[PDB]
Amino acid sequence: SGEAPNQALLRILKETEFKKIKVLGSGAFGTVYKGLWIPEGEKVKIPVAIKEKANKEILDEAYVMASVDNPGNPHVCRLLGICLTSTVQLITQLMPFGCLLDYVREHKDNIGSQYLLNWCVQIAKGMNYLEDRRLVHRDLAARNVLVKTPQHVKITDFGLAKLLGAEEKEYHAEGGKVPIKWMALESILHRIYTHQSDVWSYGVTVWELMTFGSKPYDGIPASEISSILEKGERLPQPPICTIDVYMIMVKCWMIDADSRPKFRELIIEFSKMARDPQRYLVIQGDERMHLPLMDEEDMDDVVDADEYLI
Numbered sequence: 306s307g308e309a310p311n312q313a314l315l316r317i318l319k320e321t322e323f324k325k326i327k328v329l330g331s332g333a334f335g336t337v338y339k340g341l342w343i344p345e346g347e348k349v350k351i352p353v354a355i356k357e358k359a360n361k362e363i364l365d366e367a368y369v370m371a372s373v374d375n376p377g378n379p380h381v382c383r384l385l386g387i388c389l390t391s392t393v394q395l396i397t398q399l400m401p402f403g404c405l406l407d408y409v410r411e412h413k414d415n416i417g418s419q420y421l422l423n424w425c426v427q428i429a430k431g432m433n434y435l436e437d438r439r440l441v442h443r444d445l446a447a448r449n450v451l452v453k454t455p456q457h458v459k460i461t462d463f464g465l466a467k468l469l470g471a472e473e474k475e476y477h478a479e480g481g482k483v484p485i486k487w488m489a490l491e492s493i494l495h496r497i498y499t500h501q502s503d504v505w506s507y508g509v510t511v512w513e514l515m516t517f518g519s520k521p522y523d524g525i526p527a528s529e530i531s532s533i534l535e536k537g538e539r540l541p542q543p544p545i546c547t548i549d550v551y552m553i554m555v556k557c558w559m560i561d562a563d564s565r566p567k568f569r570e571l572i573i574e575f576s577k578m579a580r581d582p583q584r585y586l587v588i589q590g591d592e593r594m595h596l597p598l599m600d601e602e603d604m605d606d607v608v609d610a611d612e613y614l615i
């Protein structure tokens with residue numbers, strides 16, 4: 306009974322009010338397009354993305370993708386509204402550089418240390434916000450992050466985002482087709498999903514970005530990981546990874562869920578590094594790479610107040 310009313314605001318739009326241009330995707334569900342939204346009256350043109358049955362209807366996808374949109378996090382992808390033609394249209398803001406997994410594989414050779422550590426602050430900022438709304442994303446990966454600008458990235462493709470009650474901090478799952486590679490040990494065993502289980506996936510997400518779009522547990526069938534992690538083995542140290550940057554990812558994989566760091570601590574740990582990225586990421590040609598300043602003595606553990614949230 307003692308819960309907060311979900312006062313989210315869904316919006317309905319017309320298929321005549323969109324001027325769809327190119328085809329972004331053709332997935333095994335629907336299709337995403339490079340649209341453009343020109344509203345009635347207003348002298349505006351907004352770049353948008355457009356999605357397009359057997360047993361249940363698709364709406365659960367958009368229900369969570371609007372409840373979190375009440376206060377606004379700038380690093381969490383948002384839904385503008387929907388169109389109700391015979392074949393319904395889901396309409397979001399356009400993030401022109403695609404997913405981040407295709408940005409660390411295509412632009413792999415021009416990724417500065419600054420660009421990397423920053424994307425890791427943004428993902429923990431947007432992932433801290435989802436925790437503040439008691440929601441568990443359950444699919445934090447490089448592929449579920451889009452590029453608004455090379456500097457501004459946002460978390461997308463919720464899919465399994467589960468809301469939690471006032472006196473609730475756990476989740477019971479029924480299996481499915483969830484990627485075991487990114488899954489925390491509890492999720493695999495007695496199928497528990499908490500905010501701390503998303504931290505393990507954050508550890509894999511950043512590990513992916515440090516290996517420049519590499520395959521976690523490459524050449525490995527998804528059935529041994531259950532006991533392979535029980536023995537103690539984990540993903541091995543990336544090359545550009547100083548012991549500072551790497552030990553964060555290791556501490557995100559501590560079996561006792563309380564030992565993993567909270568996303569507010571991850572924002573702090575990485576924000577420090579983003580002030581001097583040279584000392585933490587060893588990239589061959591660091592300063593000569595590109596993609597489209599101090600004032601104190603013991604400026605070491607110094608963090609700005611915008612990134613301090615206890």
Ligand SMILES: *CCC(=O)N1CC(Oc2cc3c(-c4c[nH]nc4-c4cccc(OC)c4)ncnc3cc2OC)C1
Pocket residue numbers: 329330337353354355356366367370384395396397398399400401402403404405406407447448449451461462
């Ligand atoms: C790594 C992910 C991937 O394979 N691709 C190609 C890249 O493209 C896009 C996609 C989008 C999207 C988007 C991606 N997947 N779903 C969406 C989306 C669109 C509308 C509504 C929802 O949620 C209900 C989700 N969103 C926005 N902009 C895109 C731009 C792309 O490349 C330019 C996705």
